[PDB]
């Protein structure tokens, strides 16, 4: 009966708790964290992934995107236009310039209103999807380059690399840069570490009301829905929290600060924006709980070469009793979004 409100939880592990990543994810799930779709973990003070960020101004952002937003009344579509390569130095100059910098504000609620008031104006540049990592090679705790989860079975058995999914991405943000409503590819988990800069704000719908958000999205954008079941996977759809309130979709809000991790959980819809110049690192990962989510993930079919993982390896290894049934197409398992991952048993005994 854990986290019955399904609110976003924040955790403050000691360095001892922190060390084993998979095991801490099982712990937070034993506390009900997954029910929110999104959780915050504040790493211990003594922890640091990089001694300094003084040297990265020469790093290349090979395909920055200008974010053109169209819409009104809490409903928008974002078009992401690939601009020419620029350096982090070139990006920071634009980010902090009078034209693109963060407006003056008092309370977060004020910055949030300005975001929803102004997101269709003066399209910003998001330095998104940059292959690479800012962790130093020796960093053994919560290293996004090597978290050591069962997602590693993809590369271990097939040799398949999916950039961003089983490798890390860097994201350089400026004010009013946005991520649209979405779950992860194959409904995996994600991890996001805010290396530096101004905050990133998040909205999250609980996985248990996820279908409700899809039904509503389908109604607001019926053309997009009629031509692709999984159109939210296109990552173009922005919906304000006032609209979510108006139609009864439970959601939570959270602001991530420099030095904080966010975890997103399978089928946890999330969206948000950056406050100003910052840098985040992200990848996906898995637990045993994810396997059923992966078997049932509704995928985008209308775009070529979208992210699709063979589940075969995972069903054979962790669900050998159900493999023949699954392969016949007769595995009718119903997901219970409240249940924690099997690995949490250690913490519930």
């Amino acid at each position: 009966t854990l986290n019955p409100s399904a609110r976003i939880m924040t955790f403050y592990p000691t360095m001892e708790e922190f060390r084993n990543f998979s095991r801490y994810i099982a712990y937070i799930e034993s506390q009900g964290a997954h029910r929110a779709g999104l959780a915050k973990v504040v790493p211990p003070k003594e922890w640091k992934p990089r001694a300094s960020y003084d040297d990265i101004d020469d790093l290349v952002i090979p395909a920055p995107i200008q974010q053109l937003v169209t819409g009104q009344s809490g409903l928008f579509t974002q078009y992401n236009i690939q601009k020419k390569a620029m350096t982090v130095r070139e990006f920071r100059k634009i980010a902090n310039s009078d034209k693109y910098c963060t407006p003056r504000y008092s309370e977060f609620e004020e910055l949030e209103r300005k975001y929803w008031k102004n997101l269709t104006f003066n399209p910003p540049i998001y330095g998104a999807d940059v292959n690479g990592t800012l962790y130093e090679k020796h960093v053994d705790e919560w290293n996004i380059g090597r978290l050591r989860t069962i997602l590693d079975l993809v590369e271990k058995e097939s040799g398949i690399t999916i950039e961003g999914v089983n490798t890390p991405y860097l994201y350089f943000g400026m004010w009013k840069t946005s991520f649209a409503w979405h779950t992860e590819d194959m409904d995996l988990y994600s991890i996001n570490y805010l290396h530096f800069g101004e905050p990133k704000s998040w909205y999250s719908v609980p996985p248990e009301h996820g279908k409700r958000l899809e039904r509503l999205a389908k109604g607001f954008f019926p053309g997009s829905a009629q031509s692709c079941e999984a159109f939210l996977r296109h990552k173009m759809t922005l919906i304000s929290p006032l609209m979510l309130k108006k139609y009864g979709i439970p959601f939570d809000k959270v602001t991530q600060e420099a030095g904080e991790f966010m975890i997103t959980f399978p089928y946890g819809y999330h969206a948000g924006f950056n406050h100003g110049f910052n840098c985040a690192e992200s990848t996906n990962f898995a637990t045993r709980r994810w396997i059923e989510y992966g078997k049932q993930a509704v995928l985008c079919s209308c775009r070529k070469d979208m992210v699709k993982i063979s589940m075969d390896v995972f069903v054979r290894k962790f669900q050998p009793e159900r493999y023949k049934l699954w392969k016949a197409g007769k595995d009718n398992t119903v997901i219970d979004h409240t249940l924690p991952t099997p690995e949490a048993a250690e913490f519930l005994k």
Binding site: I65, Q78, Y126, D129, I162, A180, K235, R303, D305, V307
Partner: peptide
């Protein structure tokens, strides 16, 4: 074959 922030 790769993760993307979003399309057009």
């Amino acid at each position: 074959a790769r993760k993307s922030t979003g399309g057009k």
